[PDB]
């Protein structure tokens, strides 16, 4: 949505490490610049891959 990542205003490394350690942890592909459906596409591909592996299994 309208929210976006804000770069730290600090000038020392400690502020940067505190900021990254305090990251929201709700990473979405939109962080990378990719569309948010990229995760859905990747999960679909992984599910198809698991289906193929299970089919090869028997």
Structure description:
- The longest helix is centred in the C-terminal third of the chain and has 21 residues, at 37-57.
- The N and C termini lie far apart (45 Å).
- With 58 residues, the protein is mostly helical.
- It contains two helices and no strands.
- It is elongated.
Write the layout of secondary structure elements.
Blueprint: H1 13-21, H2 37-57
Number of helical stretches of at least 4 residues: 2
**How does the overall form come out from the CA principal axes?**
elongated
Tell me the number of strands: 0
The string of secondary-structure elements, in order, is HH
Radius of gyration: 18 Å
Helical amount:
40-55%
Distance between the termini: 45 Å
Biggest beta sheet summary: none
Which class best fits the helix and strand makeup?
mainly alpha
Strand content: under 5%
Family: Belongs to the dynein heavy chain family.
Protein name: Cytoplasmic dynein 1 heavy chain 1
Subcellular location: Cytoplasm, Cytoskeleton
PDB class: motor protein
Descriptive keywords:
mainly alpha, 58 residues, 1 chains, elongated, 52% helix
In short:
It is found in: Cytoplasm, Cytoskeleton. With 58 residues, the chain is an all-alpha fold.
């Amino acid at each position: 949505g309208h929210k976006d990542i804000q770069m730290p205003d600090g000038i020392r490394r400690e502020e940067f490490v505190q900021w990254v350690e305090l990251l929201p942890d709700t990473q979405t592909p939109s962080w990378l610049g990719l569309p948010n459906n990229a995760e859905r596409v990747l999960l679909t591909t992984q599910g198809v891959d698991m289906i193929s592996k299970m089919l090869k299994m028997q």
